C-alpha cells in the first residue's frame, strides 16, 4: 500500500476525518484556561464541522474469534 498511496488519498483522508467535533485541545501546567480559550478561538475556530454526504466510510461491526496463529 505504501508503494501505491497517492496525494489524492491523503487529502481525502484529511477532509473526511479531521473535523472539529472530533478534536480536543488539551493543556497542563502553568496555563490559564480563559487565555487558552481566546487563543483557541483565534487560531482553531475556522476548522469546519459539517460532515458532508456522510462521506465517512462504512465498516464491519465488531466480532471476537477463538483461534490461533
Amino acid at each position: 500500500n505504501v508503494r501505491k498511496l497517492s496525494r489524492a488519498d491523503l487529502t481525502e483522508y484529511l477532509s473526511t476525518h479531521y473535523k472539529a467535533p472530533r478534536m480536543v485541545l488539551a493543556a497542563a501546567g502553568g496555563v490559564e484556561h480563559q487565555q487558552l480559550l481566546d487563543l483557541a478561538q483565534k487560531h482553531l475556530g475556522d476548522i469546519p464541522w459539517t460532515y458532508a454526504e456522510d462521506t465517512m466510510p462504512a465498516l464491519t461491526p465488531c466480532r471476537f474469534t477463538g483461534s490461533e496463529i
Binding site: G66, S67, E68
Partner: protein, 81 residues
C-alpha cells in the same frame, strides 16, 4: 527421549486455526465428500478388483467340477453287457 520440545528443526512455516465451537462438524458432505470418495474408489479399482474376480471364477469352476464327479457314468454299465 522423544518429547515435544526437540523433535526436529523447522523455519518459516505459519499455521492458522479456528476453535471447534466456531465451525461446523460436517460442513459439506454431498457437494465435496461424495465426489472425493468417488475418485478415491476410481484410483484403486483396477489394482484390487480383478484378482478377486479371478478367485470367484476359480471357486465356481472347482465346485461345478467336484459336483459333476459324483454323478454316475452311463458307459460304466452300458458298454460291455
Amino acid at each position: 527421549g522423544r518429547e515435544f520440545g526437540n523433535l526436529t528443526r523447522i523455519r518459516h512455516v505459519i499455521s492458522y486455526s479456528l476453535s471447534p465451537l466456531e465451525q461446523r462438524a460436517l460442513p459439506h458432505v454431498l457437494s465435496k465428500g461424495v465426489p472425493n470418495m468417488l475418485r478415491r474408489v476410481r484410483e484403486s479399482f483396477f489394482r484390487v478388483v480383478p484378482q478377486f474376480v479371478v478367485f470367484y471364477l476359480l471357486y465356481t469352476w472347482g465346485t461345478e467340477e467336484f459336483e459333476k464327479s459324483k454323478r454316475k457314468n452311463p458307459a460304466a454299465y452300458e458298454n460291455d453287457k
